[PDB]
Amino acid sequence: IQMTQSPSSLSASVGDRVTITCQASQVISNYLNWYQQKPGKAPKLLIYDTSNLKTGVPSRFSGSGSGTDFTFTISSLQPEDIATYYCQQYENLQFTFGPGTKVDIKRTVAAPSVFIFPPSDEQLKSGTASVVCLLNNFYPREAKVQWKVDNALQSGNSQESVTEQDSKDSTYSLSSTLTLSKADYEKHKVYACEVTHQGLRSPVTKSFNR
Amino acid sequence: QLQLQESGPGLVKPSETLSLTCTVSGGSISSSSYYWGWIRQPPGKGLEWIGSVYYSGGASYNPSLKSRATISVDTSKNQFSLNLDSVSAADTAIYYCASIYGSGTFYYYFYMDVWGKGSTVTVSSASTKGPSVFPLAPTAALGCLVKDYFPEPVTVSWNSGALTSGVHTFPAVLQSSGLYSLSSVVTVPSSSLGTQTYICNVNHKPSNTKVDKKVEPK
């Protein structure tokens, strides 16, 4: 009928007790389980039969509920508990998973470490050139990067990618790659990427020549 | 300890058929207390249970996929396989095979004990293309550029798995050419630049390509 999981997203600092709710489609008739899926990896169940927890799961994880309403609670949040949590239900010969609850960690505003990499000689020999601008460990996720070739803005020829929040220092990392042909790369000399971040008092820009 | 491992094609053309095989290790598939199932996860979506089978052959499927999916078990080879007919673009997902434990006096109570690694299946008519690795020469940062590969995914290691701290493998991005581009960097102290050597172990299973690029300064 309808299986819901609230909230959809979440953001709480390290050490906070956060509880999540799950609503089954029907009244519970088989074991209700809870799974933890870190970004990239496969799901791993922590709690089975609403309350019981698997051997090896930390004591900070707990769960309770009855009927059609259930809860998932962690006593003290730690940096490697960042994952999308799902609740499982087996009714009418069907395994149905909940929408999931994405939990994030609130961290102190950190400044990014900016690095600019020139294109390798191997790539230039092939006939293309890609210059990368790296933003290491910055919070929050919101950051703006602008490419300036010979002090002139560039648009369209660059695409960026951000990592998922870290499991140790709880920080994101960005990487924007500007791609141009070898002929267009020889036409200019100075290449820079401007980094505009809320934890950065001055827009830091890093450049190189040739 | 139970350990499941998927083995699929990675890329299947549209209107064709998808076939994955999950091999159980550290325990027999012919156990009374276990069901063996398949769950897929589309990009940026939740988990969808495809089906599940018992070691005798008792099949069970999701109503939406029951018209296409057929899961069979092989006791002599200790594995179970999924066959999803008439695959479409909407079936591009990460297919996980899981071990469903069941115990019960009246009826079995289920929870998915062990899970597999996952197979990134891409439904596309485009052909396979292996990657090209370029060094990102340089606390100083260095990395590798894995440009122009299809399809996903690519796994990049560093120093044959020894280097792990401070390594950031960025998610792939699809270029205008229809090919993916990946970047993996690592932050190491500037003093170790001359002494210690650094290599990235790029591996692209869909094309069977393994490249060990040496990253050097200047």
Q: Chain B residue closest to A33 (CA)?
A: B111
Judged by CB atoms closer than 8 Å, whether chains meet at A96 and B109 is answered as no
Q: How far apart are CA B189 and CA B142, in angstroms?
A: 11
Looking at the structure, tell me whether residues B77 and B6 fall in a common domain.
yes
d(CA A55, CA A60): 13
Residues in CB range of B166: below 8 A, 6 or more apart: B186, B187, B188
Q: Does B120 touch chain A (CB under 8 A)?
A: no
In total, how many domains does chain B have?
A: 2
**Residue B190 and residue B153 in one domain:** yes
| Distance in angstroms (rounded) separating the CA atoms of residues B176 and B168 | 24
Structure tokens at B56: 């005798």
Neighbouring-strand partners of residue A123: none
Which domains occur in chain A, in start order?
1-106 (2.60.40.10), 107-210 (2.60.40.10)
Q: Do residues B75 and B181 share a domain?
A: no
Q: Rounded to an integer, what distance in angstroms lies between the CA atom of residue A33 and that of residue A61?
A: 13
Q: Which DSSP symbol is given to A163?
A: P
Q: Which of B82, B98, B125 finishes a domain?
A: B125
CB contact under 8 A, A86 and B63: no
Tell which residue, A124, A137, A129, has the closest CA to residue A158: A129
State whether B161 and B121 are in the same domain. Answer: no
The last residue of one of the domains, among B104, B125, B146, is B125
Residue the block writes with tokens 């999540």: A20
Q: Does residue B131 share a domain with residue B94? A: no
Q: Which amino acid is at B2?
A: L
A72 interface with B at CB cutoff 8 Å: no
**Domain assignment of residue B93, given as a range:** 1-125
Q: What residues contact residue A81 under an 8 Å CB cut-off, 6+ apart?
A: A36, A60, A74, A103
CA-to-CA distance for A1 and A4, rounded, in angstroms? 10
By three-state DSSP, how is residue B83 classified?
A: strand
CATH of the domain at B182: 2.60.40.10
Rounded to an integer, what distance in angstroms lies between the CA atom of residue B52 and that of residue B72?
Answer: 9
Q: Measure the CA–CA gap between B199 and B190, rounded to whole angstroms.
A: 16
Residue A62 three-state SS = strand
CB atoms within 10 A of CB B25: 11
Instruction: Decide the pairing of beta strands B79-84 and B3-7.
Output: unpaired
CA dist B205 and A181 (Å) reads 29
| Residues A139 and A170: beta-carbon distance below 8 Å | yes
Q: Are residues B4 and B110 in the same domain?
A: yes
Listed residues B125, B140, B167: the one ending a domain: B125
Torsion of CA A193, A195, A196, A197, to 10 degrees: 170
- Give yes or no: residues B100 and B28 share one domain: yes
Answer yes or no: do B76 and B24 share one domain. yes
Q: Name the burial class of residue A87, with classes exposed (0-12), middle (13-18) and buried (19+) by CB atoms within 10 angstroms of its CB.
A: buried
Whether B120 and B132 map to the same domain: the answer is: no
Q: Are residues B180 and B72 in the same domain?
A: no
Are B166 and B87 part of one and the same domain? Answer: no
**Residues B107 and B211 both lie in one domain:** no
Kindly state whether A126 is in contact with chain B, defined as any CB-CB distance less than 8 angstroms.
yes
The technique by which this structure was obtained is: X-ray
